[model samples]
Target: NLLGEANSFLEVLEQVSHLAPLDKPVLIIGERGTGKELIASRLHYLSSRWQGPFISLNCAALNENLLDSELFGHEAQKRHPGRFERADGGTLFLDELATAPMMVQEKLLRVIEYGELERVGGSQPLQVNVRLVCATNADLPAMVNEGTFRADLLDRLAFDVVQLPPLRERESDIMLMAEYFAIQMCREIKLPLFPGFTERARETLLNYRWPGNIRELKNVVERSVYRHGTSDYPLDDIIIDPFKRRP
Candidate 1:
């Protein structure tokens, strides 16, 4: 929906339109750099709560105690309002759920079940109405089996699951996304000419096993696009190796 026009991707966009208005929680499962946040944004903008705040949190960004304070507000009043209070009638998107602590997971379950929470050190409980959306690249079921993740929380969060297909799985999308990325980067860098992909480059795109998915495609295409500022280029200009790190 963001750029590529593969029918499979179009299906994903269609699902977003259908699921956006619901009040239940959603779980998005995908590999890293697969634009899970972009999907979350689409869900929020198309939802009935479009006018309300769409607060997104990276679960890995904070430690356990900091996470608790961030999600449930700090007792230091007027100091910092947590995500739950900030989201009020909106949506809360928790990314990287695999790294979230057991305590944070418990608090999150409480919020989903009762729509209520108390600040870290506050004495009173406050009511909040927020639609929750979570994203994780990890195998959550496996984590639950290992006792690192809560099964109950997973149940509460899986009202719906949107899985972003890896770039390799969508071979029909490879060349399409490459061109789109090329055009986008060309425009971004203020290049007047349109940089097109060569046959060899296109072949490489389809054959490569894109471990990093669309994010890798963007970087690879942009590097090649920059070389074609004033003219076309050969396959050598474009780099498609997955093993070698880009400079």
Candidate 2:
């Protein structure tokens, strides 16, 4: 299973493991901080292509022009190989695919369809064999209707779309993840084996709507683990106000 080291979250394990070995292109849709990247990584690791390089890129992090240069190689000044080139004969993870511009999305479709790409300002076409996995937090169908995203591109990417439920829906998994992260953080920081959360702390964690999901839970645990010192990690030190942002 891709979640070999992190099996505490059984719900995630159950869902993810069932689809890990497939060769089809996977589209992971989820809110931010919901461990989308982790799931992608797990998929790559558990698949037949595990021996190949696992390359990841965040499409939302770059502008249209830069995104082109990043995904497909650029040959203006020099042969600036992009993520696709770097991930030749491997798996390419396109994180936040919905954020990519329409033009870039068109270019991506061409690449996926042809198995070949022309670098920016380059005349030569490079053939690459790569398994594509894309992820997005936004509603892609809505974006397609709004004309912000290309429908053809969406079709090319989403061979199999997996909608990861929000943390609120998986409330039982939250405490499991929380405890796992807590122990992990303590071990990393050389802290003592602290007791589990107090009733008040558990209530706070359970009640608070985790807008940030697993990432938020991880941060909360780390902050709480470190703040109360190595000895007797107090739940009181952990504050959970859904309205208040952490400093």
Candidate 3:
């Protein structure tokens, strides 16, 4: 679940809630390690299509040909259903959308435009009803200028855009998430009580720029809590980098 008490966080949540019921395409923009996929799932569950299947694909995970087949399916010997077909009447999440090849991008635009797609080797157009929720860390508008991403496609997919604030920008949520992660680690270790964080450790957590965002913070907090053990005092040292050699 996405957790944050900062106004920036709350404002984003408000936007998500408002857009949840709208069965149009959504574009989520955020830095790496931010909860882009999580936000996408939230949109699916809150929408009218909650009971339908939620299919997700990472556009960066496959080559152009493979991605095309995966998205629109193939019909060599037997018929195969693609993600668009599988996610019919539901939400289809495409991550790293900027990585999708121009060919695939063209087909995607076609699908969004007409709610229909033909398999890789098939000529018959199959109809599907799918709401698209895509995420990307790259600047798509810049890519459009570079002749990579399609402008018309972006116009269609960005029916509503949701932008997530970076961890450093949400200063107030730093310690809140830190403590929450700490307690979660404690539960995993079967500890009777959370040792909590020392004053110095809290300062360290709040001051450092989390380059990896929540993902990095989780690792740091979990390592600190576990290494501190079942002690009565608060945790003192936070292992920001375990790989750094001692001087």
Candidate 4:
């Protein structure tokens, strides 16, 4: 449903589609660079609240206090509405939930349970209606056990879980995504025609492990296409390892 034809990925897309119409929260679990945010965006666009804003924040991007002020807003000079209020009637995607501090986690639970939040340094309660979609690459259950994450918040956020398969698991999509990225790169560089990958190139693309997933594939393909821009024959050499020894 979202670019890949691999059964594993197709299943993920199907799960997303089914949960799109619901008002309950959804959690996306995936490894780094597996396009977790892309899936979150898909959920938002397909949801009933498609007409509203789809606000997103990576919890790991800011420190505890900054994250608090950003999400709940701070009463500095004037009343500034946070993401929850901004995403009212829409979707709020909180990425890297495991990184949220305990205090922020408590506020999140409050928002989810009562649909109310108070701006930082302010006591007045504010009501907001936002469909929550959270993503994490960390093991939240383990975090809860370790006392770094809140179990109550995890419960409310797990209305549905979409497990994204890693790129190595989705073998069917490796070359598909590679070629797609290659073609796009070729077009961007104003190539007259796309010659495609050679047999060896294809093997090289498929055989190696894509620990970084689609994002790594994209970079590799784009680099190969750009380097071979002037060649008329199929691309035979791909620079998978960027760390080359200096001559």
Candidate 2 lDDT for residue 199: 81
Q: After superposition, how far is residue 5 of candidate 1 from its true place, in Å?
A: 2.6
Q: Between 2 and 4, whose lDDT is larger? A: 4
Tens digits of per-residue lDDT for model 3, 133-231:
999988999999999999999988899889999899998999999989999999998888887788999889988988889999999999988888885
Q: How do the residues 12-106 of candidate 2 rate in per-residue lDDT, one tens digit apiece? A: 65666777777667888888887788888888788877888899999888888899888996875556888988988778999988888878889
Q: What is the C-alpha lDDT of each candidate?
A: 0.84, 0.79, 0.90, 0.87
Deviation (Å) of 48 in candidate 4: 1.2
Model 1 scores a C-alpha lDDT of 0.84
User: What TM-score does each of the candidates earn?
Assistant: 0.90, 0.85, 0.94, 0.93
Clashing pairs in 3: none
Looking at candidate 4, the ten consecutive residues that score lowest on lDDT are 117-126
- Candidate 4 deviant stretches above 4 angstroms: 119-123, 245-247
Is candidate 2 or 3 superior in lDDT? 3
Expressed as tens digits, the lDDT of each residue in 198-232 for candidate 4 is 89998899888888888898998888888788648
Where model 3 places Cα greater than 4 Å from the true spot, the runs are 120-123, 245-247
Indicate whether candidate 3 or candidate 4 has the larger lDDT.
Answer: 3
What's the lDDT for residue 161 in model 4?
A: 91
Top candidate when judged by TM-score against the true structure: 3
lDDT-based ranking: 3, 4, 1, 2
Measured with C-alpha atoms, the lDDT of residue 50 in candidate 1 is 95
